């Protein structure tokens, strides 16, 4: 079956991807001026892992 769409869940996640992707860019402006880079690497690879689940979800439906 085509299951019913998670309306409020999807609006929430598409906010957090927009806010988090702005945050990763803002933190990359501090690096122009400790200064350890693992949390930047994790915040970026988490958005790739999350954007994949939503793309794979929408492409499926």
């Amino acid at each position: 079956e085509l299951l019913p769409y998670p309306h409020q869940l999807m609006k929430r996640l598409l906010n957090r991807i927009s806010m988090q992707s702005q945050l990763i860019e803002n933190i990359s402006m501090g690096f122009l001026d400790n200064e350890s880079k693992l949390p930047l690497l994790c915040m970026e690879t988490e958005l790739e892992r999350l954007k994949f689940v939503i793309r794979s979800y929408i492409r499926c439906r």
């Binding site: 990359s28 690096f31 880079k37 930047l40 690497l41 970026e44």
Partner: protein, 564 residues
Amino acid sequence: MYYGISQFSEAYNKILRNSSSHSSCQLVIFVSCLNIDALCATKMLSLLFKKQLVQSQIVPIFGYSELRRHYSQLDDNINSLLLVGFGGVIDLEAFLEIDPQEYVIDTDSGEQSFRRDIYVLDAHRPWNLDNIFGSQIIQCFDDGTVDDTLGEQKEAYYKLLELDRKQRKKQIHEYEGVLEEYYSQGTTVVNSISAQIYSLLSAIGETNLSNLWLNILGTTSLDIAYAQVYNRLYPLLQDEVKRLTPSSRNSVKTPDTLTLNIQPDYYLFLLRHSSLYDSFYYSNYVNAKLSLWNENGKKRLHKMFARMGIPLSTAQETWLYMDHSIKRELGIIFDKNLDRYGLQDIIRDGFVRTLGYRGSISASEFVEALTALLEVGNNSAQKLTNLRKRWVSNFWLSWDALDDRKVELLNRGIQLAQDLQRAIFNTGVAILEKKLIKHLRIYRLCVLQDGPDLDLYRNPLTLLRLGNWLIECCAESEDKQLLPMVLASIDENTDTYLVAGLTPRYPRGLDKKPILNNFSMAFQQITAETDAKVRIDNFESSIIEIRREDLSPFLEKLTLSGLL
């Protein structure tokens, strides 16, 4: 001086500070292809920058003409360069057309900084002084040569740089006299580039068995031509194998155990991967002691196997299938018998790696495989370029064969090495039977005009295999005077000769101060004097190309040259 051995951590931390970001690629490594030591150095250095997450690009380069082309087109965001295996002996600031005023930033204070660093990882000498003293952008790494050897040149360089009439005549010709003696030294390799990067990994605290194997491979490649250097470094490699090898002994073999032993590694050709007969027949050293090109030399080989008590039918079995009793008795058979033939020097201890159940490879056998991948792994401007593209393409076959996941590509290499050494031998006998080595008083000349599969010898490395075979052969004969040798080979398609100048060397067991390749000056000085067409663009500047009709005029002025 520029970065001494004590201060490689500062040069590395400077790379991290300048060129680490998650935003962009910022680091470029230019590596000379056609150099195994530069390959093993660059493999270690990439595993390091992988672990630090430094985004980087590796570009293999054939020669100086391609160095200018690739440098000319670097994206201006690239702010660190490593030049691995070349450029120490050329003025890089002049050659690349740098003016530091176009590179300087934040000049304030007794201070400078620059938008690019150029770090030179090179083992060749004599160092160009305008790199080692005369530049702030070029940043050489050192084994110790500068502080130990260059103190008179340092002083002469600065007093001449400051001095932009008796009191002047009395001094300007003293200091130019010191530089003029410092140049007018022949070329030599004095260290491995891989042992330099392993001493950097030792400063950072990154050493492990994978980096140690690449250190052993890179350093072993010197043994054929710079034996005097392999023997300095070999004691230091033994200590690191002990330091990193785990506690267990009388250990059970399991698919997961890597063992990197120090054990007998006889000076024979591809022993563990060929027969015991082909091991002797195709060895440079054996051929040199037995005179094994002519059929009385082949009799001396059979007469030796018969006296050792190994049937020819057993000696010719592939070493895996050769019987369990011979393979453990072999240390005793050689320690009894080799002395009769003077082959005693074949007994050697070396590094032997075995992984799981897949059977041992020695560092010697592994570099024979990796070189065979560089050599044969796959309108004259197109005819050169579509050939130099092939030698850049082969670098990635040798690179991928350093990975343990890719043993099938090492096994390609081990088959190709046995195809090459057979062709070298079948050509080397033709030279010695037909008397093609002419004695020209100052040097020995050899010129391959025609022959079977002659189209191999247009790769600079394959010409140097045949060079090292003819050199070992001469260097053991007690009547010949040691003389520089010139080895030339035609390409019938480009219509040039590839010409290589070779240093002789002392017999493999005698134990002197080194001798230096002064063809690198003699070819430049004769080239500057003549109107002939040549290429002087190779990184091993003992090797040149010349159009067919210009060769005899060139050699005619080489014999007159006082520079050899």
